[PDB]
Each structure stands twice: as C-alpha cells, then as structure tokens.
Ligand binder design. Structure first.
Ligand SMILES: CN(C)CCCN1c2ccccc2CCc2ccc(Cl)cc21
Ligand SMILES: CN(C)CCCN1c2ccccc2CCc2ccc(Cl)cc21
Ligand SMILES: CCCCCCCCO[C@@H]1O[C@H](CO)[C@@H](O)[C@H](O)[C@H]1O
Ligand SMILES: CCCCCCCCO[C@@H]1O[C@H](CO)[C@@H](O)[C@H](O)[C@H]1O
Ligand SMILES: CCCCCCCCO[C@@H]1O[C@H](CO)[C@@H](O)[C@H](O)[C@H]1O
Ligand SMILES: CCCCCCCCO[C@@H]1O[C@H](CO)[C@@H](O)[C@H](O)[C@H]1O
Ligand SMILES: CCCCCCCCO[C@@H]1O[C@H](CO)[C@@H](O)[C@H](O)[C@H]1O
Ligand SMILES: CC(C)C[C@H](N)C(=O)O
Ligand code: NA
Ligand code: NA
Length: 512
C-alpha cells in the first residue's frame, strides 16, 4: 500500500479519544487530585493543560501526520526526517521504548479490571459483614491482595493467582484480536463501539454515586473538595510536578502513541480541530466523569479526611478496594462493581492498543514485517516482559516512573525542541496549521516556542534535583532488576533501529 488511513473523521476522533481516555482518567486522576488537596491540584492542572497539554497534542499530531505522509509512523524515523542527525534516531528510540515499557505494566493492570469484572459479574466477591470501616474494607483488600499475590512475608516477590494469570493471557489475546485487524477495521472499528459504551457506563456510575449519602457526607461534599480553590499551594513544586505528570499521562503525550496514530491521518486532513477535540473529550471524561465517581463516593462514605488518607495509602486502593467496598453496601452493589470494572476494562483496552501500535508501526514501516507478524511479535515481547511486573514487587512502580512519569516529560521536551527549534518554529507552525479546519490561536506560537519548553525544562531540573536522588538512594535493591531489564529493552530497540538503517542502505543500493 502506501499507508493505512483512518476511514472516517468520527472514527479518527473516537480512536484518538480512546487512546487518551483510559485508566488514567478513572484511577490515576482521582488519586493525584485527592492526594494533592483536591481543588489545590486543579489550578496547576488546568494551567498545565493550557500551557503543555494542548500545545504538545497539536505538535504530536503534526509530527505524526508529517511522518505518515512519507511512510513513517514512529519517532526513530520521524525525528530523523525533522533533523537528519544520527543522534535524532537514537533519541527517537524513546518513542518506542516508552510505549513498550508502559504497555508491559499497563496491560497487566488492565487485565485486573477484566478479572475483577468477571468475578463481580458472577458474584464471586468478598462478603463484608454488618458499618466499622475496616471490617468493611479488609475483605476487599484481601481480595485484591490474593488476586495479584501481594507479599505476605519479607521476600519482594508477588504470587499472582492462577485466575489472574489466565485473565492476563485473555487480555493479551483481546488486544491482539483488535490490533491484528489494523487501523480502520481494527482500532477505529473498535473505538466506535467502545467509546459510546464507555461514556454511557461512566454517566450511569456518576448518577448512581451522586445518590450516595451517609452520616459522614454526600457525593456533593466530594465535588466541593475537588472543585474548591486553595491558592496557598500554587507555590508548591510537588503539586505542579504531579499536575503536569497527570496531564502528560492522561493525554497520552510523550508516549509516541499520539504521533503514531496521527501517522495514519491523510496528509491533507485537519489536525488542529481534531487534536483539540480529542484532547477536550479526554478532559471532560477525566474531570467530569472520572472526578465525579471515586472521590465523591469515598468522601460520602468516609468524609474528606479519610478519603484523602485512602488515596495517599496508595496501591490501587481507591479503585480496586475502596470503591467496590462502598458499592457492596448498596442494593445491586456487586453489579455496580461489575459495571465499574467493565468501564475500566474498556477504558484500558482502548488505551493499551494505542501504546502497542508504535512498536507494530515500527516493525511494519522500518523492518517491513507484515501486520500479522508485527502484531504477534509485539504481543510476545509485552507478554514475556510482563512477567517481571507480575512477579517482582515494585517493578510496576519502577517502570511507571522511568517511562510513564519522567520519560514522557523528557520526551515531550525532546520532541518539542526537535520540531519547534531544530526543524524550525515557522516550518513547524506552518505544518501544524496546514489543512486545519481552524487555525491555532496565534498566542500559542509563542507558547510552543518559548513557554512550554521553559516550563518543562524547569520541571525536569526540579525533579532531578529534589526527587530522583531519593528514588536512586532510598529504594529496595530489587529496583535494579527492573532498571537493568528496561535498559536492556532500550539497547535491543536501538539494535532494531540499526538493523532498519542497514536494511534501508541495502535496498537503496538495490534501488540503483
Ligand atoms: C458487536 N460486535 C461487533 C462487537 C464485538 C467485536 N469486537 C471488535 C469490534 C470492532 C473491531 C474489532 C473487534 C475485535 C474483537 C473484539 C474483541 C473484544 C471485544 Cl470486547 C470486542 C471485539
Ligand atoms: C504507586 N503504585 C502502587 C501505583 C503506580 C501505578 N499507577 C497507575 C498506572 C497506570 C494506570 C493506572 C494507575 C492507577 C494508580 C496510580 C496512581 C497515582 C500514580 Cl502517580 C500512579 C498510578
Ligand atoms: C514464557 C516465560 C515463562 C516464565 C515463567 C512463567 C511461570 C508462570 O507460571 C504460572 O504462574 C501462574 C500465576 O502465578 C500460576 O497460577 C501457575 O500455576 C504457574 O504455573
Ligand atoms: C474466565 C474463566 C477463567 C477460568 C480459570 C479460573 C482459575 C481460578 O482458580 C483455579 O481454577 C483451577 C481449575 O478450575 C483450579 O485447579 C485451581 O486450583 C484454582 O485456583
Ligand atoms: C522477571 C520475571 C520472572 C518470572 C518467573 C516466574 C516463575 C514462576 O514460578 C512459579 O510461580 C508459580 C505461581 O506464583 C508457583 O506456584 C510455582 O511454584 C513457581 O515455580
Ligand atoms: C522477578 C523474579 C520473580 C521470581 C518469583 C519466583 C517465585 C519462585 O518460587 C521459588 O522458585 C525457586 C526456584 O525454582 C524454588 O527453589 C523455591 O522453592 C520457590 O518458592
Ligand atoms: C496560554 C494559552 C492561552 C490560549 C487561549 C487562546 C484564546 C484565543 O484568543 C484569541 O485568538 C485569536 C486567534 O489568534 C485572536 O484573533 C483573538 O483576538 C484572541 O482573543
Ligand atoms: C499511556 C496512555 C495510553 C494512558 C492513557 N492516556 C490513560 O489516561 O490511561
Ligand atoms: Na486519559
Ligand atoms: Na482508553
């Protein structure tokens, strides 16, 4: 062919919206917000969306469409197209490494939601007794802990239940069944089914939650806590780092995923309005839907102070333990739990296929593998690698940090510098607006060229100076097992880019 292309504009928008709308909206956002003072988190969040989220979204859509027009959907080649320096290809490897590493733990978490959905649907759930908080949360904590196999001793090892393992296998098979059908007949087709389902399930859950009321509060108290400003924290670096990190994660920015999806957009197609729409749809799903489910429910039943303590407790407690526990105290609560996990599963699935496609696109575009082989090998690498996340306690956290937290911010800055500084601000601006149904507001030219990069640069330095040291000095030794492995993955991916180069050289000397 030349390239596969999104069939319809609606399919394109829903596929991109599904790329973005995932576990980050319903699980990550609530914890981050509650953990950072709720309303106090929102100001930096909104600012990050305007100064970082929106501008980078347009930039990645532009880079992808630009690359696609020349038959390239991933950063190793696209970065090179924008800056013909071998170093561009190496920096580009992060556009394959980040999504791959994130997929290695993201699909596993996604599989938990399918496993929970299954168990809640058939009623194989814990039975709490008769209004102490712990006698109520404990059965659900044990339920999660037995599912993933949390360490009961001193060894930093996890023991996933057999059901969890088999469900991960099924989950991988489901991701493959969609990806193996390609862009239009696979990802786009699925998005047209999943997004509407996702929206309906989420609205229903918000409505149900809004009816919650106990001696400790109502869902309204939850919304008040999340949407009430606290200008006295606008000066804490930590809240800003959390806010910006969430924006990157929730919009799928810096993962090379938006770029790859955009590489299937026809060269002439608009990306300004489409990009803004995908981004806007994600924010609504995040702040309106995701923000209105778990926090209001937790606050209604336990009050703000306890809700916050829950979010800070961590380990998927809010979404996999607390919410289902709360639901169990209501009529039809087990089924509500099913709907919650089913919602999470579809949110995750539409996002995981998005972070596996970069590796698939690279194998197809640069190594010329058939889609079938590219999808199967990608799945094999993710499946194999995930065993590290399934059996080594904290490996998931380590990957989520280096690739999904630090990595994306670093890559976002990198792609911006390459596209807006090296490739050329005016050429980049031109490329972004080309074919647009609407033009990017002019003030954004200055935001992209000066504000965004300066913003990310400062964030990254603050990170390396007052946070990375603790992570490098105060963690259990087992973190090095994961660091070693993912560094190895980077090395391997660089080797593949080298092979792509050599294949390119040999076909050019065969093109003459
Ligand atoms: C009414 N049916 C069209 C929906 C079931 C098909 N579907 C689907 C839809 C569009 C494009 C690819 C795929 C692949 C198979 C698959 C796998 C899992 C799920 Cl959760 C849905 C699903
Ligand atoms: C601290 N870890 C136990 C958890 C890290 C995983 N993670 C994550 C990663 C992918 C998808 C959903 C979620 C939900 C939980 C959550 C909450 C806050 C943060 Cl900042 C990360 C985070
Ligand atoms: C292909 C790479 C394989 C690495 C070793 C994988 C071992 C998986 O082993 C399986 O794990 C499940 C969940 O913990 C258990 O329920 C099964 O009984 C066990 O056989
Ligand atoms: C979606 C269907 C998943 C079926 C796998 C369920 C695994 C849950 O549990 C396992 O089931 C096995 C066979 O029933 C038993 O031999 C194991 O002892 C038991 O732990
Ligand atoms: C870095 C990833 C390494 C994965 C190696 C997994 C080896 C699996 O090991 C197996 O796990 C089962 C369930 O936990 C146990 O029941 C078996 O006794 C054990 O041998
Ligand atoms: C990241 C690696 C996680 C590994 C989890 C391993 C759980 C293994 O289980 C252990 O395997 C050993 C060797 O087979 C046996 O000698 C032990 O008796 C057994 O408990
Ligand atoms: C920090 C980023 C803020 C983005 C808000 C942009 C609001 C758009 O602002 C509008 O842009 C148009 C096109 O440039 C101008 O013609 C209008 O006069 C201006 O009000
Ligand atoms: C890594 C990304 C695909 C994650 C997705 N944007 C989410 O919010 O879950
Ligand atoms: Na999102
Ligand atoms: Na999604």
């Amino acid at each position: 062919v030349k390239r596969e292309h999104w069939a319809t504009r609606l399919g394109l928008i829903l596929a991109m919206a599904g790329n973005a709308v995932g576990l980050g909206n319903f699980l990550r956002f609530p914890v981050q917000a509650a953990e950072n003072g709720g309303g106090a988190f929102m100001i930096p969040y909104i600012i990050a969306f305007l100064l970082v989220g929106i501008p980078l979204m347009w930039i990645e859509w532009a880079m992808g469409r630009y690359g696609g027009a020349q038959g390239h959907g991933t950063t190793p080649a696209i970065f090179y197209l924008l800056w013909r320096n071998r170093f561009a290809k190496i920096l580009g490897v992060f556009g394959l490494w980040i999504p791959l590493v994130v997929a290695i733990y993201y699909v596993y978490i996604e599989s938990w939601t399918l496993g929970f959905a299954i168990k809640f649907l058939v009623g194989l759930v814990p039975e709490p007794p008769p209004t102490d908080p712990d006698s109520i949360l404990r059965p659900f904590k044990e339920f999660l802990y037995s599912y993933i196999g949390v360490p009961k001793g001193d060894e930093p090892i996890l023991k996933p239940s057999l059901f969890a393992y088999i469900v991960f296998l099924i989950t991988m098979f489901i991701n493959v069944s969609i990806l193996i059908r390609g862009i239009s007949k696979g990802i786009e087709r699925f998005a047209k089914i999943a997004m509407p389902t996702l929206f309906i399930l989420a609205v229903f859950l918000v409505i149900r939650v809004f009816l919650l009321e106990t001696p400790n509060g109502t869902a309204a108290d939850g919304l008040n806590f999340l949407w009430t400003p606290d200008f006295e924290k606008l000066k804490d670096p930590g809240v800003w780092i959390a806010a910006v990190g969430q924006i990157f994660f929730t919009l799928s920015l810096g993962f090379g995923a938006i770029i790859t999806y955009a590489s299937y957009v026809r060269k002439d197609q608009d990306i300004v309005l489409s990009g803004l729409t995908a981004a806007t749809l994600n924010e609504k799903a995040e702040v309106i839907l995701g923000g209105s489910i778990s926090i209001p429910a937790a606050v209604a039943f336990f009050g703000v102070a306890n809700a916050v303590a829950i979010a800070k407790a961590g380990a998927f407690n809010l979404g996999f333990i607390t919410l289902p526990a709360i639901f169990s105290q209501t009529a039809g609560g087990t089924f509500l739990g099913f709907l919650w996990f089913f919602l999470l599963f579809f949110a995750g699935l539409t996002s995981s296929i998005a972070i596996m496609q970069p590796m698939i696109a690279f194998l197809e575009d640069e190594l010329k593998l058939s889609r079938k082989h590219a999808v199967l090998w990608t799945a094999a690498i993710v499946f194999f690698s995930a065993h590290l996340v399934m059996f080594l306690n904290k490996s998931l956290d380590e990957m989520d940090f280096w690739a999904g937290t630090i990595g994306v911010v670093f890559f976002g800055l990198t792609e911006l510098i390459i596209f807006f500084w090296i490739f050329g601000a005016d050429k980049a601006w031109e490329e972004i607006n080309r074919g647009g149904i609407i033009k990017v507001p002019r003030i954004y030219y200055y935001v992209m060229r000066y504000i965004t990069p300066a913003f990310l640069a400062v964030l990254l330095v603050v990170w390396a100076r007052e946070y990375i040291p603790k992570i490098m000095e105060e963690t259990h030794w087992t973190v090095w097992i994961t660091r070693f492995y993912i560094i190895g993955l980077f090395l391997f991916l660089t080797f593949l880019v080298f092979l792509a180069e050599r294949r390119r050289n040999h076909e050019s000397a065969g093109t003459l």
